[PDB]
Design a protein around this ligand. Sequence first.
Ligand SMILES: CCC(=O)Nc1cccc(-c2c(-c3ccc(N4CCN(C)CC4)cc3)[nH]c3ncnc(OCC(C)C)c23)c1
Length: 313
Amino acid sequence: EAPNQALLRILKETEFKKIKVLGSGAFGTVYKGLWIPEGEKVKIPVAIKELREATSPKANKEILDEAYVMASVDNPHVCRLLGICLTSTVQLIMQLMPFGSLLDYVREHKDNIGSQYLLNWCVQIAKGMNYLEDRRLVHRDLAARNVLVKTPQHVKITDFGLAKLLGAAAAEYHAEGGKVPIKWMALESILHRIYTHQSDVWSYGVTVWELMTFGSKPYDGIPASEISSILEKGERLPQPPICTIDVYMIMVKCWMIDADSRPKFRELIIEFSKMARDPQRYLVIQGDESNFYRALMDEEDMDDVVDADEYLI
Ligand SMILES: CCC(=O)Nc1cccc(-c2c(-c3ccc(N4CCN(C)CC4)cc3)[nH]c3ncnc(OCC(C)C)c23)c1
Protein backbone atom coordinates (compact mmCIF):
# COMPACT_ATOMS: atom_id res chain seq x y z
CA GLU A 1 0.00 0.00 0.00
CA ALA A 2 0.99 3.68 0.02
CA PRO A 3 3.96 4.57 2.27
CA ASN A 4 2.95 6.27 5.51
CA GLN A 5 4.92 9.51 5.45
CA ALA A 6 3.36 11.04 8.56
CA LEU A 7 5.86 12.99 10.68
CA LEU A 8 6.34 12.21 14.38
CA ARG A 9 7.54 15.30 16.23
CA ILE A 10 9.49 14.81 19.47
CA LEU A 11 8.94 17.73 21.87
CA LYS A 12 11.17 19.15 24.59
CA GLU A 13 9.66 19.00 28.08
CA THR A 14 10.71 22.64 28.62
CA GLU A 15 8.61 24.05 25.78
CA PHE A 16 5.20 23.18 27.19
CA LYS A 17 3.59 24.20 30.49
CA LYS A 18 1.04 22.16 32.44
CA ILE A 19 -1.82 24.32 33.74
CA LYS A 20 -4.36 21.97 35.36
CA VAL A 21 -5.47 18.34 35.57
CA LEU A 22 -8.37 17.58 33.22
CA GLY A 23 -8.80 14.02 34.49
CA SER A 24 -6.97 11.08 36.01
CA GLY A 25 -7.05 7.29 35.87
CA ALA A 26 -4.82 4.26 36.23
CA PHE A 27 -3.51 4.93 32.71
CA GLY A 28 -2.38 8.32 34.00
CA THR A 29 -3.27 12.01 34.15
CA VAL A 30 -4.43 14.21 31.27
CA TYR A 31 -3.22 17.79 31.79
CA LYS A 32 -4.31 20.98 30.07
CA GLY A 33 -1.59 23.36 29.03
CA LEU A 34 0.32 25.52 26.57
CA TRP A 35 2.88 24.34 24.01
CA ILE A 36 5.31 27.08 22.98
CA PRO A 37 7.68 25.74 20.28
CA GLU A 38 10.97 27.62 20.38
CA GLY A 39 11.71 30.03 17.54
CA GLU A 40 8.00 30.32 16.65
CA LYS A 41 5.79 33.05 18.11
CA VAL A 42 2.83 30.69 18.67
CA LYS A 43 1.09 29.22 21.72
CA ILE A 44 -0.94 26.01 21.20
CA PRO A 45 -3.59 24.97 23.73
CA VAL A 46 -2.80 21.31 24.33
CA ALA A 47 -3.95 18.32 26.33
CA ILE A 48 -1.03 16.37 27.78
CA LYS A 49 -1.54 12.68 28.55
CA GLU A 50 1.17 11.62 31.00
CA LEU A 51 1.64 7.94 31.82
CA ARG A 52 1.16 7.13 35.51
CA GLU A 53 4.29 5.01 36.02
CA ALA A 54 7.57 4.99 34.08
CA THR A 55 8.14 1.26 34.69
CA SER A 56 5.19 -0.45 32.96
CA PRO A 57 6.44 -1.96 29.66
CA LYS A 58 2.97 -2.86 28.35
CA ALA A 59 1.66 0.64 29.07
CA ASN A 60 4.61 2.30 27.33
CA LYS A 61 4.06 0.16 24.22
CA GLU A 62 0.36 1.03 24.24
CA ILE A 63 0.87 4.80 24.48
CA LEU A 64 3.33 4.71 21.56
CA ASP A 65 0.88 2.62 19.53
CA GLU A 66 -1.66 5.37 20.20
CA ALA A 67 0.82 8.02 19.01
CA TYR A 68 1.58 5.98 15.88
CA VAL A 69 -2.02 5.89 14.68
CA MET A 70 -2.81 9.45 15.83
CA ALA A 71 0.18 10.87 13.95
CA SER A 72 -1.06 8.99 10.87
CA VAL A 73 -4.27 11.06 10.49
CA ASP A 74 -4.79 14.69 9.39
CA ASN A 75 -8.49 15.55 9.21
CA PRO A 76 -10.55 18.46 10.58
CA HIS A 77 -12.83 15.95 12.31
CA VAL A 78 -10.10 13.86 13.95
CA CYS A 79 -8.13 15.00 17.00
CA ARG A 80 -4.53 15.67 15.95
CA LEU A 81 -1.31 14.60 17.68
CA LEU A 82 1.12 17.47 18.13
CA GLY A 83 3.96 15.26 19.35
CA ILE A 84 5.34 13.02 22.06
CA CYS A 85 7.89 13.72 24.79
CA LEU A 86 10.26 10.92 25.79
CA THR A 87 10.71 11.74 29.46
CA SER A 88 10.96 9.15 32.23
CA THR A 89 7.17 9.01 31.88
CA VAL A 90 6.07 9.33 28.25
CA GLN A 91 3.74 12.22 27.39
CA LEU A 92 1.34 12.54 24.45
CA ILE A 93 0.67 16.15 23.44
CA MET A 94 -2.68 16.58 21.71
CA GLN A 95 -4.90 19.38 20.50
CA LEU A 96 -6.93 20.74 23.41
CA MET A 97 -10.66 20.04 23.24
CA PRO A 98 -11.95 22.53 25.84
CA PHE A 99 -15.49 21.22 26.35
CA GLY A 100 -14.80 17.53 27.00
CA SER A 101 -16.61 14.54 25.58
CA LEU A 102 -19.75 14.89 23.50
CA LEU A 103 -21.42 12.38 25.85
CA ASP A 104 -20.86 14.67 28.84
CA TYR A 105 -21.85 17.72 26.78
CA VAL A 106 -25.31 16.46 25.76
CA ARG A 107 -26.04 15.29 29.31
CA GLU A 108 -24.99 18.76 30.50
CA HIS A 109 -27.18 20.77 28.06
CA LYS A 110 -30.27 18.66 27.32
CA ASP A 111 -32.38 21.84 27.34
CA ASN A 112 -30.18 24.00 25.11
CA ILE A 113 -29.22 21.56 22.31
CA GLY A 114 -31.14 22.00 19.07
CA SER A 115 -31.59 19.78 16.03
CA GLN A 116 -29.12 21.83 13.95
CA TYR A 117 -26.28 20.88 16.31
CA LEU A 118 -27.25 17.21 16.63
CA LEU A 119 -27.46 16.76 12.86
CA ASN A 120 -24.22 18.68 12.25
CA TRP A 121 -22.45 16.50 14.85
CA CYS A 122 -23.68 13.40 13.02
CA VAL A 123 -22.30 14.79 9.75
CA GLN A 124 -18.95 15.66 11.30
CA ILE A 125 -18.48 12.24 12.92
CA ALA A 126 -19.37 10.52 9.64
CA LYS A 127 -16.80 12.68 7.84
CA GLY A 128 -14.15 11.75 10.39
CA MET A 129 -14.99 8.06 10.11
CA ASN A 130 -15.02 8.20 6.30
CA TYR A 131 -11.57 9.79 6.46
CA LEU A 132 -10.42 6.98 8.76
CA GLU A 133 -11.83 4.54 6.18
CA ASP A 134 -9.73 6.13 3.42
CA ARG A 135 -6.70 5.74 5.71
CA ARG A 136 -7.68 2.04 6.04
CA LEU A 137 -7.96 2.50 9.82
CA VAL A 138 -10.57 0.74 11.98
CA HIS A 139 -11.40 2.67 15.17
CA ARG A 140 -12.94 -0.25 17.10
CA ASP A 141 -14.13 2.05 19.89
CA LEU A 142 -16.48 4.61 18.35
CA ALA A 143 -18.74 6.00 21.07
CA ALA A 144 -20.01 9.34 22.32
CA ARG A 145 -17.42 9.23 25.12
CA ASN A 146 -14.65 9.16 22.47
CA VAL A 147 -15.89 12.20 20.49
CA LEU A 148 -14.61 15.49 21.91
CA VAL A 149 -15.91 19.04 21.59
CA LYS A 150 -13.52 21.72 20.33
CA THR A 151 -16.42 24.16 20.04
CA PRO A 152 -20.16 23.42 20.21
CA GLN A 153 -20.05 23.70 16.41
CA HIS A 154 -17.05 21.38 15.87
CA VAL A 155 -16.52 17.85 17.20
CA LYS A 156 -13.61 15.45 16.62
CA ILE A 157 -13.05 11.70 17.00
CA THR A 158 -10.33 10.65 19.46
CA ASP A 159 -9.19 7.78 21.74
CA PHE A 160 -7.38 5.51 19.29
CA GLY A 161 -6.17 3.11 22.00
CA LEU A 162 -8.08 0.29 20.29
CA ALA A 163 -7.63 1.45 16.69
CA LYS A 164 -5.93 -0.88 14.21
CA LEU A 165 -4.43 -0.12 10.80
CA LEU A 166 -5.48 -2.62 8.14
CA GLY A 167 -2.60 -4.27 6.31
CA ALA A 168 -2.26 -4.34 2.55
CA ALA A 169 -5.08 -6.19 0.73
CA ALA A 170 -7.05 -6.90 3.95
CA ALA A 171 -10.48 -5.57 4.90
CA GLU A 172 -10.94 -7.39 8.24
CA TYR A 173 -8.97 -7.28 11.49
CA HIS A 174 -9.02 -10.30 13.81
CA ALA A 175 -8.48 -9.32 17.44
CA GLU A 176 -7.17 -11.32 20.35
CA GLY A 177 -9.22 -11.58 23.53
CA GLY A 178 -9.32 -8.34 25.50
CA LYS A 179 -11.52 -5.83 27.29
CA VAL A 180 -13.88 -4.37 24.72
CA PRO A 181 -17.17 -2.38 24.75
CA ILE A 182 -19.82 -4.91 23.75
CA LYS A 183 -22.88 -2.63 23.64
CA TRP A 184 -21.23 -0.62 20.82
CA MET A 185 -19.97 -3.59 18.77
CA ALA A 186 -21.30 -5.19 15.61
CA LEU A 187 -22.54 -8.76 16.03
CA GLU A 188 -19.62 -10.22 14.08
CA SER A 189 -17.20 -8.52 16.50
CA ILE A 190 -18.88 -10.00 19.59
CA LEU A 191 -18.96 -13.54 18.22
CA HIS A 192 -15.89 -13.79 15.96
CA ARG A 193 -13.80 -10.75 17.01
CA ILE A 194 -13.82 -9.57 13.38
CA TYR A 195 -13.60 -5.81 12.88
CA THR A 196 -14.16 -3.88 9.65
CA HIS A 197 -15.12 -0.36 8.64
CA GLN A 198 -18.67 -1.76 8.53
CA SER A 199 -18.24 -2.83 12.16
CA ASP A 200 -17.45 0.82 12.92
CA VAL A 201 -20.70 1.82 11.17
CA TRP A 202 -22.56 -0.26 13.75
CA SER A 203 -20.83 1.73 16.50
CA TYR A 204 -21.71 4.91 14.62
CA GLY A 205 -25.42 4.08 14.95
CA VAL A 206 -25.12 3.49 18.69
CA THR A 207 -23.21 6.77 18.99
CA VAL A 208 -26.04 8.58 17.17
CA TRP A 209 -28.56 6.88 19.47
CA GLU A 210 -26.53 8.23 22.40
CA LEU A 211 -26.76 11.77 21.01
CA MET A 212 -30.46 11.46 20.11
CA THR A 213 -31.38 10.26 23.63
CA PHE A 214 -29.28 13.08 25.21
CA GLY A 215 -26.76 10.76 26.85
CA SER A 216 -28.69 7.59 27.69
CA LYS A 217 -26.88 4.30 28.29
CA PRO A 218 -27.54 1.72 25.53
CA TYR A 219 -29.23 -1.42 26.89
CA ASP A 220 -29.25 -0.03 30.42
CA GLY A 221 -29.61 -2.79 33.00
CA ILE A 222 -28.82 -5.62 30.55
CA PRO A 223 -25.66 -7.73 30.98
CA ALA A 224 -23.21 -7.71 28.10
CA SER A 225 -23.29 -11.51 27.90
CA GLU A 226 -26.95 -11.49 26.82
CA ILE A 227 -26.42 -8.75 24.18
CA SER A 228 -25.42 -11.35 21.58
CA SER A 229 -28.61 -13.41 21.87
CA ILE A 230 -30.72 -10.22 21.95
CA LEU A 231 -29.15 -9.07 18.69
CA GLU A 232 -29.58 -12.51 17.07
CA LYS A 233 -33.28 -12.45 17.99
CA GLY A 234 -33.63 -9.23 15.99
CA GLU A 235 -34.08 -6.76 18.86
CA ARG A 236 -32.38 -3.34 18.62
CA LEU A 237 -32.26 -0.07 20.55
CA PRO A 238 -35.64 1.74 20.43
CA GLN A 239 -36.54 4.88 18.48
CA PRO A 240 -35.52 7.99 20.47
CA PRO A 241 -38.52 10.26 21.19
CA ILE A 242 -37.16 13.24 19.19
CA CYS A 243 -36.34 11.12 16.14
CA THR A 244 -38.50 11.07 13.08
CA ILE A 245 -38.56 7.71 11.34
CA ASP A 246 -36.20 9.25 8.76
CA VAL A 247 -33.43 9.43 11.34
CA TYR A 248 -34.25 6.18 13.14
CA MET A 249 -34.26 4.24 9.85
CA ILE A 250 -30.61 5.23 9.35
CA MET A 251 -29.73 3.97 12.83
CA VAL A 252 -31.60 0.69 12.17
CA LYS A 253 -29.74 0.22 8.86
CA CYS A 254 -26.44 0.55 10.76
CA TRP A 255 -27.47 -2.51 12.83
CA MET A 256 -28.07 -4.98 10.00
CA ILE A 257 -26.43 -8.33 10.76
CA ASP A 258 -25.13 -8.40 7.16
CA ALA A 259 -22.25 -5.91 7.36
CA ASP A 260 -22.34 -5.14 3.63
CA SER A 261 -26.02 -4.19 3.94
CA ARG A 262 -25.15 -1.37 6.36
CA PRO A 263 -24.49 2.12 4.99
CA LYS A 264 -21.02 3.34 4.19
CA PHE A 265 -19.80 6.44 6.04
CA ARG A 266 -19.82 8.09 2.62
CA GLU A 267 -23.59 7.58 2.50
CA LEU A 268 -24.12 8.64 6.13
CA ILE A 269 -22.52 12.02 5.33
CA ILE A 270 -24.92 12.54 2.41
CA GLU A 271 -28.05 11.50 4.31
CA PHE A 272 -27.41 13.54 7.47
CA SER A 273 -26.31 16.51 5.32
CA LYS A 274 -29.72 16.55 3.64
CA MET A 275 -31.39 16.52 7.05
CA ALA A 276 -29.05 19.24 8.31
CA ARG A 277 -30.52 21.51 5.59
CA ASP A 278 -33.94 21.38 7.36
CA PRO A 279 -33.28 20.15 10.90
CA GLN A 280 -36.68 20.62 12.54
CA ARG A 281 -38.24 18.35 9.89
CA TYR A 282 -36.17 15.39 11.11
CA LEU A 283 -35.81 16.06 14.86
CA VAL A 284 -38.73 17.31 16.97
CA ILE A 285 -37.34 19.07 20.06
CA GLN A 286 -39.29 21.21 22.53
CA GLY A 287 -38.27 24.86 22.29
CA ASP A 288 -36.02 24.23 19.29
CA GLU A 289 -34.07 27.31 18.15
CA SER A 290 -9.49 35.63 22.23
CA ASN A 291 -10.50 36.35 25.82
CA PHE A 292 -11.95 32.82 26.10
CA TYR A 293 -8.44 31.37 25.75
CA ARG A 294 -7.18 33.77 28.44
CA ALA A 295 -9.76 32.47 30.93
CA LEU A 296 -9.21 28.85 29.88
CA MET A 297 -5.39 28.79 30.05
CA ASP A 298 -5.23 31.32 32.93
CA GLU A 299 -2.55 33.36 31.12
CA GLU A 300 -2.83 37.10 30.53
CA ASP A 301 -0.94 37.11 27.20
CA MET A 302 -2.94 35.31 24.50
CA ASP A 303 -1.92 37.41 21.48
CA ASP A 304 0.03 34.52 19.93
CA VAL A 305 -2.49 31.78 20.74
CA VAL A 306 -3.10 29.48 17.76
CA ASP A 307 -5.32 26.42 17.59
CA ALA A 308 -3.53 23.32 16.32
CA ASP A 309 -5.98 23.26 13.39
CA GLU A 310 -4.23 26.42 12.14
CA TYR A 311 -0.78 25.02 13.01
CA LEU A 312 0.81 22.81 10.34
CA ILE A 313 4.29 21.78 9.17
C1 LIG B 1 -11.98 9.16 26.75
C2 LIG B 1 -12.92 9.86 27.74
C3 LIG B 1 -12.34 11.13 28.39
O1 LIG B 1 -13.04 11.82 29.14
N1 LIG B 1 -11.06 11.38 28.07
C4 LIG B 1 -10.47 12.47 28.56
C5 LIG B 1 -9.91 12.52 29.83
C6 LIG B 1 -9.29 13.69 30.26
C7 LIG B 1 -9.22 14.81 29.43
C8 LIG B 1 -9.78 14.76 28.15
C9 LIG B 1 -9.74 15.81 27.32
C10 LIG B 1 -10.42 16.96 27.43
C11 LIG B 1 -11.30 17.37 28.35
C12 LIG B 1 -12.10 16.49 29.09
C13 LIG B 1 -13.01 16.98 30.01
C14 LIG B 1 -13.17 18.35 30.20
N2 LIG B 1 -14.06 18.79 31.10
C15 LIG B 1 -14.34 20.24 31.03
C16 LIG B 1 -15.12 20.63 32.28
N3 LIG B 1 -16.38 19.88 32.37
C17 LIG B 1 -17.04 20.22 33.64
C18 LIG B 1 -16.14 18.43 32.31
C19 LIG B 1 -15.34 18.05 31.07
C20 LIG B 1 -12.39 19.23 29.46
C21 LIG B 1 -11.47 18.74 28.53
N4 LIG B 1 -10.10 17.74 26.41
C22 LIG B 1 -9.23 17.08 25.66
N5 LIG B 1 -8.62 17.46 24.53
C23 LIG B 1 -7.73 16.61 23.89
N6 LIG B 1 -7.49 15.38 24.47
C24 LIG B 1 -8.12 15.06 25.61
O2 LIG B 1 -7.89 13.84 26.17
C25 LIG B 1 -8.15 12.87 25.15
C26 LIG B 1 -7.77 11.48 25.64
C27 LIG B 1 -8.03 10.46 24.53
C28 LIG B 1 -6.28 11.47 26.01
C29 LIG B 1 -8.99 15.88 26.21
C30 LIG B 1 -10.39 13.59 27.73
